Amino acid sequence: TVMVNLTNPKRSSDYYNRSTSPWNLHRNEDPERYPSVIWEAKCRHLGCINADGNVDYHMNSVPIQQEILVLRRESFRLEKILVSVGCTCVTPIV
Amino acid sequence: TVMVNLNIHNRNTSDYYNRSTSPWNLHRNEDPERYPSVIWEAKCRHLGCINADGNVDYHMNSVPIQQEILVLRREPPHSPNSFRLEKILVSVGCTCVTPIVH
Numbered sequence A: 001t002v003m004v005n006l007t008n009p010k011r012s013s014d015y016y017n018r019s020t021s022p023w024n025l026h027r028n029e030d031p032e033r034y035p036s037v038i039w040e041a042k043c044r045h046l047g048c049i050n051a052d053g054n055v056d057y058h059m060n061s062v063p064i065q066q067e068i069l070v071l072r073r074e075s076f077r078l079e080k081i082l083v084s085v086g087c088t089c090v091t092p093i094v
Numbered sequence B: 001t002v003m004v005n006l007n008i009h010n011r012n013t014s015d016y017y018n019r020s021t022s023p024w025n026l027h028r029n030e031d032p033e034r035y036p037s038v039i040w041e042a043k044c045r046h047l048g049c050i051n052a053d054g055n056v057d058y059h060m061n062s063v064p065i066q067q068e069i070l071v072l073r074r075e076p077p078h079s080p081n082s083f084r085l086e087k088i089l090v091s092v093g094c095t096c097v098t099p100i101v102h
């Protein structure tokens, strides 16, 4: 137990819309948490968008996750959580 | 100023990054004055994206995906706080974007 003294690009980025594996954000709010609001990505399609603007289901939209530090009120407890931050397009086999 | 229970935290030293059409490499961001002191950040391998033939198509863009994250910053011992909470940006991977539509 220690004493701790206490700009988001998602407010302006457009990759979620122009990606071949686009996504949308879901608001995760917790007033018992710092940060109080985090935004999690959910891939928009199963497959990926091809050059004709159609979903190619052989390719796979998958979410990229990042482990982040959060504070949970207890005075706080330091914890780690897994957040989906965007999606990428993968081939199922090389 | 708050009181943080660090509980069981201690310092430490999928293959999408390769199968993606916008593949990336991870680079070591190290700062002994920070917790976590090491963060692995992505840097896209190419300006373009990989096409069905396995070559790079530069009319498409590989771009990094960023996440704002909390980190602990070391405070001098003279200070009543052990740590200083900060926000930094980390690239977690890359995506392939079209530069223009239609």
Ligand SMILES: O=C(O)c1cc(NCc2ccccc2OCCOCCOCCOc2ccccc2CNc2cc(C(=O)O)cc(-c3ccnc4ccccc34)c2)cc(-c2ccnc3c2CC=CC3)c1
Pocket (backbone or CB within 6 Å): A018, A019, A020, A048, A049, A050, A051, A052, A053, A054, A056, A059, A089, A090, A091, A094, B018, B019, B020, B021, B049, B050, B051, B052, B053, B054, B055, B057, B060, B096, B097, B098, B101, B102
């Ligand atoms: O097995 C597969 O097929 C395989 C496929 C891909 N990349 C191609 C690909 C990606 C995604 C879907 C299909 C793909 O291929 C389909 C068959 O090819 C049709 C040919 O198209 C020409 C090129 O197109 C691309 C080239 C690069 C990236 C994305 C695309 C296609 N998307 C696209 C193109 C364009 C453009 O303007 O061209 C515009 C948009 C667009 C984006 C967003 N909103 C829109 C809205 C409206 C209109 C367009 C859009 C999307 C890589 C690997 C692979 C991945 C990783 N390691 C390896 C390999 C393959 C081999 C070895 C290793 C394997």
